[PDB]
Amino acid sequence: KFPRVKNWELGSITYDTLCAQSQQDGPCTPRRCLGSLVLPRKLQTRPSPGPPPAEQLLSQARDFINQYYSSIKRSGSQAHEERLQEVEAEVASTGTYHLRESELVFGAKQAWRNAPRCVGRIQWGKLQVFDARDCSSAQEMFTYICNHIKYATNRGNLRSAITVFPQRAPGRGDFRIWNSQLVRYAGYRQQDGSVRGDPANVEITELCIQHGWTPGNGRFDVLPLLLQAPDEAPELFVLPPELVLEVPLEHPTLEWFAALGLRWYALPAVSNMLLEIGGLEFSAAPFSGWYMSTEIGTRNLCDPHRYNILEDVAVCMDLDTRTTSSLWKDKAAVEINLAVLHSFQLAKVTIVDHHAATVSFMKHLDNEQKARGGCPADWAWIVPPISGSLTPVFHQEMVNYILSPAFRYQPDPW
Amino acid sequence: GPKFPRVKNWELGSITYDTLCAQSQQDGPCTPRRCLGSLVLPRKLQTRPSPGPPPAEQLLSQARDFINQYYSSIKRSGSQAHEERLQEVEAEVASTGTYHLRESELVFGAKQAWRNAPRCVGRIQWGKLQVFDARDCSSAQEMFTYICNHIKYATNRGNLRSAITVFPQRAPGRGDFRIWNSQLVRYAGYRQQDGSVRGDPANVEITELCIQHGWTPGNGRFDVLPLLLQAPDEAPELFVLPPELVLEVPLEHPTLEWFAALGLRWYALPAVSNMLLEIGGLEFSAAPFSGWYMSTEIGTRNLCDPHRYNILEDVAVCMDLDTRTTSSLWKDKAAVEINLAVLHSFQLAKVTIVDHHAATVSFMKHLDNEQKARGGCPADWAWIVPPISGSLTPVFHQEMVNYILSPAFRYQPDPW
Numbered sequence: 029k030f031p032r033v034k035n036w037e038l039g040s041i042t043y044d045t046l047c048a049q050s051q052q053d054g055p056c057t058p059r060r061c062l063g064s065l066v067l068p069r070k071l072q073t074r075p076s077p078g079p080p081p082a083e084q085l086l087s088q089a090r091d092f093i094n095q096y097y098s099s100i101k102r103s104g105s106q107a108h109e110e111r112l113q114e115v116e117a118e119v120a121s122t123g124t125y126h127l128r129e130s131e132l133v134f135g136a137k138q139a140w141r142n143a144p145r146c147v148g149r150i151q152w153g154k155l156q157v158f159d160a161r162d163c164s165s166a167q168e169m170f171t172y173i174c175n176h177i178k179y180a181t182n183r184g185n186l187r188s189a190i191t192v193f194p195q196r197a198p199g200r201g202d203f204r205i206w207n208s209q210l211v212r213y214a215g216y217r218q219q220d221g222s223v224r225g226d227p228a229n230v231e232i233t234e235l236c237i238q239h240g241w242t243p244g245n246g247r248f249d250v251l252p253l254l255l256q257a258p259d260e261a262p263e264l265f266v267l268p269p270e271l272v273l274e275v276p277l278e279h280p281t282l283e284w285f286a287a288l289g290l291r292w293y294a295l296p297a298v299s300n301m302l303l304e305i306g307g308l309e310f311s312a313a314p315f316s317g318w319y320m321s322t323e324i325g326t327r328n329l330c331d332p333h334r335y336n337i338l339e340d341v342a343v344c345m346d347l348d349t350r351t352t353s354s355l356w357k358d359k360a361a362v363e364i365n366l367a368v369l370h371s372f373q374l375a376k377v378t379i380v381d382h383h384a385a386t387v388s389f390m391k392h393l394d395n396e397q398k399a400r401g402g403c404p405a406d407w408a409w410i411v412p413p414i415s416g417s418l419t420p421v422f423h424q425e426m427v428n429y430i431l432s433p434a435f436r437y438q439p440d441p442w
Numbered sequence: 443g444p445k446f447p448r449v450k451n452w453e454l455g456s457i458t459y460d461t462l463c464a465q466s467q468q469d470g471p472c473t474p475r476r477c478l479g480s481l482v483l484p485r486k487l488q489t490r491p492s493p494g495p496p497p498a499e500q501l502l503s504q505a506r507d508f509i510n511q512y513y514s515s516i517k518r519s520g521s522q523a524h525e526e527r528l529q530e531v532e533a534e535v536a537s538t539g540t541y542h543l544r545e546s547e548l549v550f551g552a553k554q555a556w557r558n559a560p561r562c563v564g565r566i567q568w569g570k571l572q573v574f575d576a577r578d579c580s581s582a583q584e585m586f587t588y589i590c591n592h593i594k595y596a597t598n599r600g601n602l603r604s605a606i607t608v609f610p611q612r613a614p615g616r617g618d619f620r621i622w623n624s625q626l627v628r629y630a631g632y633r634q635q636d637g638s639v640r641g642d643p644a645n646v647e648i649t650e651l652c653i654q655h656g657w658t659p660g661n662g663r664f665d666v667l668p669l670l671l672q673a674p675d676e677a678p679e680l681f682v683l684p685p686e687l688v689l690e691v692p693l694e695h696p697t698l699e700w701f702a703a704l705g706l707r708w709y710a711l712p713a714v715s716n717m718l719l720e721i722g723g724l725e726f727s728a729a730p731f732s733g734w735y736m737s738t739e740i741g742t743r744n745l746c747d748p749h750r751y752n753i754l755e756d757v758a759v760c761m762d763l764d765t766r767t768t769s770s771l772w773k774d775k776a777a778v779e780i781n782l783a784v785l786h787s788f789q790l791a792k793v794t795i796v797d798h799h800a801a802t803v804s805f806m807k808h809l810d811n812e813q814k815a816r817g818g819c820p821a822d823w824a825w826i827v828p829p830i831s832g833s834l835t836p837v838f839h840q841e842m843v844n845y846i847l848s849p850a851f852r853y854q855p856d857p858w
């Protein structure tokens with residue numbers, strides 16, 4: 029009924045009862061596990077041209093409202109009862125409803141808390157929520173986004189934040205941020221199909237150019253934003269350079285590293301995910317925290333389909349790249365992650381290494397075990413891309429399931 | 443489009459569909475409600491002791507399926523020999539309650555079980571396996587002889603060869619043939635007065651069991667344990683492996699001259715001996731198998747795990763790294779050198795070994811072959827991706843579908 033969860037490094041055991049509260053299905057079935065897959069299809073977020081089944085929506089709505097009032101120890105209170113009646117009344121007459129800022133703030137934090145793929149959830153209680161539901165144009169979205177960036181960056185002392193734009197409305201286009209992150213380096217298709225810059229951003233780089241952007245020719249050219257207001261062609265907005273803080277990468281001992289001319293931005297702001305609270309959907313709700321060094325040092329800079337700088341640093345380190353057994357790849361990767369941590373600390377910009385991060389996640393697991401009886405976690409995503417078993421999370425079994433509020437993936441707007 | 447799991451490789455952007463999972467006849471631990479893919483032993487395959495004979499109905503179904511697999515493998519499906527072999531199995535189960543496998547069927551099943559192992563990254567070698575038939579074995583002493591021959595052939599003085607030795611299958615209300623040790627080669631785990639452990643903490647229980655059975659314990663950090671072999675309805679008998687048969691490799695580093703002074707070492711042969719081999723319903727409770735190590739098994743897990751030898755801090759102190767702060771990545775640096783030491787030492791000793799890069803690259807090739815041969819390959823991502831440099835290897839970027847196929851190697855409860 030309830031899964032027995034074990035930590036093999038300590039011998040400790042727990043039972044996940046929280047999973048019982050999951051009302052949404054994942055990709056697995058008793059015949060086969062699909063937990064290693066990145067995207068669903070069944071868990072996506074289909075169009076919104078028609079009103080969501082009043083029965084469905086109301087159910088999800090009552091549940092969330094119930095959650096909210098429990099959180100403020102006012103369950104069964106007068107306000108609780110009248111709030112439910114309001115939601116019922118609004119849905120019944122308009123086929124939808126709206127949240128109060130306080131409830132929105134609660135929903136946003138809960139969505140983060142329920143994010144199975146986030147290793148930094150111990151910070152889930154400290155989140156600055158910018159209500160931008162009073163947005164009616166792409167130009168306004170841009171101002172909000174510029175303020176979110178200014179606040180979150182805080183001159184290098186990053187602070188977690190999220191900005192929530194208008195909810196989806198039946199038969200009306202969605203407010204969407206086309207870029208996957210608020211800060212993305214351009215990826216220019218050159219010569220023989222090769223790519224200058226960030227291969228991951230080739231498509232978005234092309235769309236920008238198509239919408240009037242004057243491309244550059246560097247490896248780290250900050251892309252413009254394509255903000256889109258309902259049923260309107262997206263608009264191009266250039267981010268003020270002074271707002272986009274970047275960190276030049278150098279190595280604590282390897283003098284030549286700096287020569288490589290590598291750099292990375294300080295603000296990790298996902299902007300293509302959908303935020304669902306009480307059945308309501310927010311197609312544009314950009315959120316940001318601070319980077320865990322492996323995201324940059326290992327995935328972004330070392331992935332074969334990303335910057336793929338592994339061989340370069342290896343050759344500079346004069347490593348034997350003739351064979352796998354020399355572990356030249358493992359050696360350069362460690363120096364690159366070291367360089368990221370070194371540089372960020374030198375620039376006085378918030379960042380967390382994978383050891384510190386996973387240790388804090390273990391504490392979070394414990395806090396949640398006592399607080400909710402479990403904690404949805406995606407093992408494949410929580411374990412760092414390098415030095416896996418060298419971290420506590422590797423030796424920790426985890427249960428994965430869908431709780432709401434939740435951050436979900438949604439189709440690309442184009 | 444296709445009504446099967448869509449699998450993607452994010453490095454290459456290639457897509458495949460796994461249709462082989464449709465052949466899975468056994469349910470795993472996940473449900474649409476929650477994924478338990480990260481649990482080491484969810485209560486699923488777990489071949490718990492089912493004494494009283496199995497439902498002739500259930501066994502027959504499993505047996506017919508296996509026989510079909512066999513005749514298909516030889517390309518004689520639907521033939522007269524196929525139908526006659528099917529009749530024979532049914533007749534045998536009808537009169538005895540069980541049945542027996544022909545020689546070539548056992549070889550086929552042994553390999554299919556390896557081929558079907560979701561947690562094995564070395565499956566590209568699945569076709570090359572030496573199958574020692576030991577279904578005639580009638581004593582714990584004879585079990586020891588068989589095992590010794592296995593080790594000799596498998597070790598082959600450094601040039602390791604994969605092999606499995608199959609002892610008598612489980613029989614109606616009779617005792618099982620069991621090897622108590624999890625592996626043919628295990629280092630003792632001595633519990634100290636202060637509560638710590640000298641040697642390998644993973645083997646504390648088996649060590650205390652050998653002692654309780656008359657073994658005179660040593661006090662080293664790497665004392666090779668004796669084997670506790672158990673023939674049907676008999677108490678386990680203790681057997682000490684002839685030192686000359688247990689090939690070991692002293693560990694040294696290619697450039698850090700002091701590493702050898704650590705006196706670390708590991709045995710060359712990885713022989714899992716506590717798993718149950720299941721074929722067409724028949725259960726071989728004792729069927730030790732061995733291949734060759736992937737360097738991370740030794741260098742990352744066995745030597746650096748917190749609950750194993752835990753030598754990370756000692757090696758870092760020796761490398762004079764700042765072990766007072768996580769951001770120095772002293773754990774990462776020490777781990778890389780320790781792993782290099784294992785690859786270096788094994789190569790020096792001319793003992794077969796494969797790094798996590800070469801191994802994963804070959805598994806990707808294996809996935810390609812299997813997509814073509816069977817339309818899929820059951821794989822456990824958490825176990826396929828190496829314990830270090832995960833995303834530096836190709837498997838990290840390959841989505842995988844996990845499911846249970848038989849023949850199979852399953853976990854089984856400890857005999858004690």
Ligand code: HEM
Nearest residue numbers: 140143145146147148151188189315316317318319320435
């Ligand atoms: C406070 C610092 C934070 C750190 C260090 C952190 C770290 C991480 C890491 C390492 C990942 C995986 C990134 C990847 O591999 O692409 C991630 C994913 C995620 N985080 Fe956090 N996180 C933090 C804050 C936040 C905040 C503020 C939110 C939301 C309000 C959040 C929501 C998520 C979600 C939904 C995912 C999955 C995104 C996806 O599927 O692409 N995180 N986080």
Ligand code: HEM
Nearest residue numbers: 556559561562563564567604605731732733734735736851
């Ligand atoms: C030729 C060399 C081989 C290599 C490099 C290889 C490598 C591996 C690795 C890395 C593991 C994981 C070990 C762990 O984390 O505990 C493993 C597991 C496994 N391998 Fe292979 N393998 C090979 C040969 C074999 C053979 C010959 C068989 C059987 C006939 C086999 C059956 C399995 C099974 C059942 C598991 C899972 C065992 C468990 O759950 O602990 N392997 N193998």
Ligand SMILES: C[C@H](O)[C@H](O)[C@H]1CNc2nc(N)[nH]c(=O)c2N1
Nearest residue numbers: 064065066408409838839840841
């Ligand atoms: C195929 C596999 O699911 C994929 O490569 C996953 C693995 N783990 C991950 N973990 C994190 N944090 N981020 C990722 O993008 C991934 N990618």
Ligand SMILES: C[C@H](O)[C@H](O)[C@H]1CNc2nc(N)[nH]c(=O)c2N1
Nearest residue numbers: 422423424425480481482824825
């Ligand atoms: C909890 C988690 O499932 C566990 O630590 C797994 C992860 N991956 C593994 N992978 C391999 N090859 N071997 C193991 O023992 C494990 N342990």
Ligand SMILES: [Zn+2]
Nearest residue numbers: 056061472477
């Ligand atoms: Zn699953």
